[PDB]
Design an enzyme around this catalytic site. Structure first.
Site, mmCIF file in Angstrom:
data_model
loop_
_atom_site.group_PDB
_atom_site.id
_atom_site.type_symbol
_atom_site.label_atom_id
_atom_site.label_comp_id
_atom_site.label_asym_id
_atom_site.label_seq_id
_atom_site.Cartn_x
_atom_site.Cartn_y
_atom_site.Cartn_z
ATOM 1 N N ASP A 1 0.824 -1.208 0.000
ATOM 2 C CA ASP A 1 0.000 0.000 0.000
ATOM 3 C C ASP A 1 0.859 1.259 0.000
ATOM 4 O OD1 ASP A 1 -1.953 1.898 0.326
ATOM 5 O OD2 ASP A 1 -2.393 1.388 2.433
ATOM 6 N N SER B 1 -0.371 15.486 -12.219
ATOM 7 C CA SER B 1 -0.616 15.111 -13.598
ATOM 8 C C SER B 1 -0.827 16.360 -14.441
ATOM 9 C CB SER B 1 -1.835 14.185 -13.669
ATOM 10 O OG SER B 1 -2.217 13.925 -15.003
HETATM 11 C C1 LIG Z 1 -8.945 1.971 0.127
HETATM 12 C C2 LIG Z 1 -9.813 2.611 -0.739
HETATM 13 C C3 LIG Z 1 -10.000 3.979 -0.626
HETATM 14 C C4 LIG Z 1 -9.316 4.698 0.362
HETATM 15 C C5 LIG Z 1 -8.453 4.047 1.221
HETATM 16 C C6 LIG Z 1 -8.254 2.676 1.106
HETATM 17 C C7 LIG Z 1 -7.294 1.975 2.040
HETATM 18 C C8 LIG Z 1 -7.790 0.736 2.776
HETATM 19 C C9 LIG Z 1 -6.526 0.002 3.123
HETATM 20 C C10 LIG Z 1 -5.578 0.254 1.944
HETATM 21 N N1 LIG Z 1 -6.123 1.468 1.244
HETATM 22 O O1 LIG Z 1 -9.460 6.052 0.507
HETATM 23 C C11 LIG Z 1 -10.563 6.609 -0.224
HETATM 24 C C12 LIG Z 1 -10.695 6.011 -1.568
HETATM 25 O O2 LIG Z 1 -10.854 4.587 -1.508
#
Ligand SMILES: c1cc2c(cc1[C@H]1CCCN1)OCCO2
Ligand SMILES: c1cc2c(cc1[C@H]1CCCN1)OCCO2
Length: 330
Positions: A35, A199
């Protein structure tokens, strides 16, 4: 040193990707979600509330001869999708694709929120954003990348995510066979702890490119592409019957549609996301309404180049003294 590990979609929609990680001695292999939008390496464990474990592989520190409790340390994290987890901390040996870090902070979950429990395929997260976001208290801990960096042949890692297929995370080297053309590098701000960049614009399908600065983060841990409402509206306006649904929670479109591509700018270069990458399938089993892979970032507070965007590219996370991001077509 270098490392190279294969990353594999968890399901048929590429909702996330998991990469095997060896923790402890003897090795305990857990499948972690790498992540670049967070900075904690946390795992389901023998300490996780039993009712909150449903099929995950757990780390058991008491079975690792190299595990040591990091006395007094706790962690607690809340993510942008509403999920969360918390617990205590061990240090242990962690290896990814042949690259080993000793004394890595391994954050052991005592509690995880329902969406983590409900996803049997993800055994934890391995954060690759900047260590300034790490949640361990009272002594903040370093990411796996931060700990490995000085030992790497080059202070970089790369993400090469597949569409409906496995891909690769490499540490310490750039695989020049893994992309076409050249890599275009672009500036990064670390001020918010993310791989944050700007971007240079976008196009929808075969339309003309719109030059416009879009600040956002390169986040392998977010599935979709979240962009300003103006941009997102321009995209979905090209799909007959597409609409934003408050009840579903974003743009939906007829499953009978053929989706246009979406291009984003990286400096003077262009990355093309094929239309198929933007299809996230029926909103519920058997529905003819399909969920879109490009969604508005309004309310989220930041634009997010998640997997939908990143998997269209070979992406270099350059952790040199002044970090940068590189994108190539592939
Ligand atoms: C997933 C999806 C999202 C997000 C955050 C996450 C986290 C969950 C654990 C790893 N990433 O923030 C808002 C957009 O969608
Ligand atoms: C597919 C279909 C949906 C949905 C979400 C998804 C994917 C996108 C990333 C993780 N799940 O939410 C709304 C209903 O339909």
């Amino acid at each position: 040193s270098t490392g190279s590990a294969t990353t594999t979609p968890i399901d048929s929609l590429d909702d996330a990707y998991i990469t095997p990680v060896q923790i402890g001695t003897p090795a305990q292999t857990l499948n972690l979600d790498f992540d670049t939008g967070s900075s904690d390496l946390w795992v389901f464990s023998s300490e996780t509330t039993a009712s909150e474990v449903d099929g995950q592989t757990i780390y058991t520190p008491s079975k690792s001869t190299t595990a040591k409790l990091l006395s007094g340390a706790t962690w607690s994290i809340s993510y942008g999708d509403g999920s969360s987890s918390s617990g205590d901390v061990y240090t242990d040996t962690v290896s990814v694709g042949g690259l080993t870090v000793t004394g890595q902070a391994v954050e052991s979950a005592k509690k995880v929120s329902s969406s983590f429990t409900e996803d049997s395929t993800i055994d934890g997260l391995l954060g690759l954003a900047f260590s300034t976001l790490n949640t361990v208290s009272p002594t903040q801990q370093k990411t796996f990348f931060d700990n490995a960096k000085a030992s790497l042949d080059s202070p970089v890692f790369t993400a090469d995510l597949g569409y409906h297929a496995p891909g690769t995370y490499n540490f310490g080297f750039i695989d020049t066979t893994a992309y076409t053309g050249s890599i275009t590098y672009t500036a990064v701000s670390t001020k918010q702890g993310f791989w944050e960049w700007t971007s240079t614009g976008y196009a929808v399908g075969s339309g003309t490119f719109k030059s416009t600065s879009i600040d956002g983060i390169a986040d392998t841990g977010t599935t979709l592409l979240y962009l300003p409402a103006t941009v997102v509206s321009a995209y979905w306006a090209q799909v007959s019957g597409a609409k934003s649904s408050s009840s579903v929670g974003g743009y939906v479109f007829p499953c009978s549609a053929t989706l246009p591509s979406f291009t984003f700018g990286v400096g003077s270069a262009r990355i093309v996301i094929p239309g198929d990458y933007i299809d996230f399938g029926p909103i519920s089993t058997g529905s003819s309404s399909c969920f879109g892979g490009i969604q508005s970032s309004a309310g989220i507070g930041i634009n997010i180049f998640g997997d939908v965007a990143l998997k269209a590219a070979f992406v270099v996370f350059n952790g040199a003294t002044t970090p940068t991001l590189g994108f190539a077509s592939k």
